[PDB]
Amino acid sequence: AVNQSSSVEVSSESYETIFSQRIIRDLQKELVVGALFEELPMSSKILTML
Amino acid sequence: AVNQSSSVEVSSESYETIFSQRIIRDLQKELVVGALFEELPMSSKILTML
């Protein structure tokens, strides 16, 4: 961390730096089939019609 | 020259001409990368994030 290069004063070891807890986000698919098709509510397990 | 032609007799030596004290140049370049992306300020040698 503070190494590479540590010369000539304080060398110390490694983890000697502030870290950031913030996240970021890359790519995504845009959702075009999960919200485009009509919902049919039903109270059973199978629905039948002629 | 300055010694030719003597008008009519009396003439002066070389380096008798007044000039302009200023500095200038015809062109510079084009420059754009230094004012494009944001700056990220950092006190430490390095920074980590998840």
- Residue B24 corresponds to which tokens in the numbers above? 């200038």
CA distance A1 to A15: 6
8 Å CB contact between A10 and B39: no
Å from A9 to nearest chain B CA? 15
CA distance A3 to A12: 7
- Residue B43 corresponds to which tokens in the numbers above? 């006190």
DSSP state of A19: E
Tell me the one-letter amino acid at A11. S
Nearest residue, CB atoms, B49 vs list A1, A2, A19: A19
Nearest chain A residue (CA) to B49? A20
Burial (Cβ within 10 Å: 0-12, 13-18, ≥19) of residue B10: exposed
CB contact under 8 A, A19 and B47: yes
CA distance A7 to A5: 6
CB contact under 8 A, B49 and A2: no
